[PDB]
Amino acid sequence: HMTAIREIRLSEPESAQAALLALECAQRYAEPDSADFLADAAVLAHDLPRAVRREVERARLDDRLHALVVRGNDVDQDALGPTPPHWRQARTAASRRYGFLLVLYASLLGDVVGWATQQDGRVVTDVLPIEGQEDSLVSSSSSVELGWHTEDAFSPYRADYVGLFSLRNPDSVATTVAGLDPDLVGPAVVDVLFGERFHIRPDNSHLPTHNSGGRLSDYFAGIVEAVENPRAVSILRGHRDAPQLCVDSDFTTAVDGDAEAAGALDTLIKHLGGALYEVVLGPGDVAFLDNRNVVHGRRPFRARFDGTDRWLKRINVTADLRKSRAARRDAQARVLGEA
Amino acid sequence: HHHSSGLVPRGSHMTAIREIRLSEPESAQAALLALECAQRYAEPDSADFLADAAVLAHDLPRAVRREVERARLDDRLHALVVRGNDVDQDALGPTPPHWRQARTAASRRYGFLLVLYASLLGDVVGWATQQDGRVVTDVLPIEGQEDSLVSSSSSVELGWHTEDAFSPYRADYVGLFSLRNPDSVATTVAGLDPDLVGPAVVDVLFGERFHIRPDNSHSDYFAGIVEAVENPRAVSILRGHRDAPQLCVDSDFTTAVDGDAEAAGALDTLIKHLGGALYEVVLGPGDVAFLDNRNVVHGRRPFRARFDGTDRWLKRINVTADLRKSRAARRDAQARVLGEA
Ligand SMILES: N=C(N)NCCCC[C@H](N)C(=O)O
Ligand SMILES: N=C(N)NCCCC[C@H](N)C(=O)O
Ligand SMILES: [Fe+3]
Ligand SMILES: [Fe+3]
Known part of the structure; x- marks a missing residue:
């Protein structure tokens, strides 16, 4: 399908409009997954540029979508500061605005969710290389290719979309993508x-080895x-x-x-391994992978661990929050596995 | 003629009914948007409109959108009720004698507006075997079908049910837009209080x-x-x-x-429990309800149909939170008719 990758390149005004809205959210709310913000998120997302909302809606109803990519969001590299050395340290003041903007885009496609058993139950998560995890099978790996996967493939509550907001990617490391041709x-x-x-x-x-020791x-x-x-x-x-x-x-x-x-x-x-194609998310690029249609991964790369490394914000999106209520603490709670 | 909203309890269900009253400006804003859709798109359920419907719904009044969104995520909701939309009774003309004659030019604007409200909650769907697979359907009494088990009945109670209870593709919401209801005839509703x-x-x-x-x-x-x-x-x-x-x-x-x-x-x-727990929701002209079909059964009381063009008339729609899940039962990606293929 010629539109399996749907791209929107933002105009300067569209980029600025989306940044202003994200900064207004950061002015109002504490965390990009604060409960009050998430209750408000669907309607605030409606204030994103109309031309962008139209393309996101075309992607949402395209059942052969591989990924929607929104290119050219504003990212102030100097203001952002160094890439944290661990996702535990990645909830930085300067990165809040990008977490808010990721949730606003994501809320056009569905409702955001997290996992009690991933990154301490954060809804906005971080993808950055961790020293000692180079050869791991987790998204903080670098030297060893991240093996292609459906996100949370084991779970009936797996996302419909995986959202990735690239903050920085100086070596143009590719996200890998493959669909199945029956x-x-x-x-x-x-x-x-x-x-x-x-x-x-x-x-x-x-596993508890990839969460804080105090987690229940x-x-x-x-x-x-x-x-x-x-x-x-x-x-x-x-x-x-x-x-x-x-x-x-x-x-x-x-x-x-x-x-x-x-x-x-x-x-x-063998079929998915060869079909695997590359999508490079540059700073300010937001991708939504249709987790029903594609497996994804990440090419091997050499991390510098000097504060300059590749850094994405990430989010899981469900088309149907209600369906996972058995696995959530209460109606508004977004963390799968708290029940 | 000011905006208001509030929670109306039924038994222990503290948010059973979420009621919104449109201000005059909000009613006019919603009417103008529906009339602009009617000028730009062929039908309230044509592919061209339904591809855009979820985005055009974002042009509804902001205060209404915030309250509808709170209803969408309320997993104990029975009915969201939006009261006070504009209906021009004179321009609308008589209640048709059969749903086969009910997709009228004069009533198209209300089909567009029902789909716009509905598209805040999910994606609209229809059923191949129901009213020729129309997504916007018609509820009105049909002469000679007074005593039936379907929504065209009058003299006999429409027994309460989950909408399409047999189907794994059953709707998450049933939407009802009242065009006329001179005798204040109710939809019956019940949830389970465990x-x-x-x-x-x-x-x-x-x-x-x-x-x-x-x-x-x-x-x-x-x-x-x-x-x-x-x-x-x-x-x-x-x-x-x-x-x-x-x-x-x-x-x-x-x-x-x-x-x-x-x-x-x-x-x-x-x-016996749900039968004893049934309550009613009456929609006056321009009142719209969305029943949370995951939470409530619904039906309709006997009423006195006249078959003179003055009878109760609703536009009706089904909404799914997850259109993709039914793809095996739909003709193609964008098609909205369950059981079409
Ligand atoms: N085949 C592999 N490696 N599968 C695991 C992929 C990593 C996904 C996980 N949510 C993470 O962020 O680590
Ligand atoms: N318990 C009963 N009566 N069940 C059948 C109801 C039929 C409903 C159908 N959507 C209609 O509009 O006719
Ligand atoms: Fe992944
Ligand atoms: Fe019904």
Whole structure:
């Protein structure tokens, strides 16, 4: 599909209008995921430039979308200061305005959510390289390519969109993207992948090793159960003409003794690996990946750990907040796994 | 003639009804936007309009949008009611004698406005087997159908139900825009108060121990419809968080699993509870309601239809929070008609 990547390059006025609105939010509210801001977020998002809202709406209803990319948001590199050395330190005063702007864009597509078991239950999260995590399977890696995945593939409450706001990317490190062409894998493999014949485990970002030590053990019970005793699930669902994709290259296995399944997965892993194409998010670029249609990852790179490294703000978006109420503390709470 | 909004309780449901009263300027602003849409787009449910509807809805009055957004995220809502839209009765002309004659030029502006309000809550959808798959449908009494199980009845009660209770693609909201209602005829509404029901019955209702068959109203999809009647899947009536459970039941079309006497008992306990808990919402001309179909059943009282062009007439719509989830039951990405393919 020629519009699988939908791009909007902001005019100077559109960039300035979006920055003014984000700065007005930072003037009013404490955190870019403060409860009062999130209650207000859908309507405040309506104040984004009309031409931009029109293109975001076209992307939202495009069921073959890979990513919407909004290029050319204002990012003041000097005002922003150094790239923090850990996501725990990345809730900086100077970066608030970019968290608010990410939530405003995201709220055109759905409702923002976070995870009790990821980055201490923050809704606005950070992607930056961490010294000692170079060879990890988590988004703070650098030397080892981030393996392609559906975000939170293990969960029925996985996002419909993953939002990425690039604050800085001096070495032009690519985000990787791939969809599935059913015609190129075969009706045979599609049929197998549509069967509940696979195990998808929570990735390592959901482990207590990637959260603050004080975070409640109760939050992690469900994750540990999903690692030990994964449910039998499909990789494909929906219409045969526009099927949804759910798979993590490093956390997905066929159910024991299902050689057909093991072979379908093997064939899917080889097909997605080669199809993987590059999208570079420069400073001020906001992307929304359709997590129903594509797997994504990140090319290997050398981090400098000198305060100049690549830094994204990130958010999960659901089309339907109500559906996850069983996993949320209360109606307005956005943190999946607090119930 | 000033803006107001407020919470109207029913039993223990403290936000059951969220009521908004449009100021005269807000009513005029909403009417002007609907009239501009009617000048720029062919139909209230044409592809050209529905591609834009969610963005054009952002042009509705800001104070109204803030209150509708609070209703959208209230998981205990029964009905959002927006009162005081402009309806020109003289220009509207008579209530048509059948929905097949009800998609009138004079009434198009109210179809556009219903879709604009609806598009603040989600994406509009229709049903292949209902009013020729129209997304904006018509509720009016039809002569010779006074005694029926459908919304064109009058003399007999329209039994309460979750809208399309049998379907995994059932709406999140049912929208109603009243064009005329001279005799103040009500929609009936009930939710479950779990503090009025034995916890054992509530536990049974969460079990997949019931058959919700479609009405006679309702191909891979239509193979699913025959299966739904002949080999109905075991489904729950309650689902989700115990503090905010969703409800899915049809007073005329729900039974327990074969030989599950305990489920048959819990079902009948729930039917008697909801029947006793029914209250009413009356929409005057220019009043719009959105029922949260996840939380409430609805129906309609007997009323005295005259079939003289003066009868009660609503525009009606279904809204989904998640259009993508039904793609297997829609013709193409943008098509809004469930069961079309
Ligand atoms: N195949 C792999 N590596 N899957 C895990 C990807 C990392 C995603 C996680 N939310 C994070 O931000 O770390
Ligand atoms: N319990 C009952 N009566 N269930 C059937 C109701 C039919 C509703 C349909 N949307 C209509 O407008 O006719
Ligand atoms: Fe990811
Ligand atoms: Fe109904």
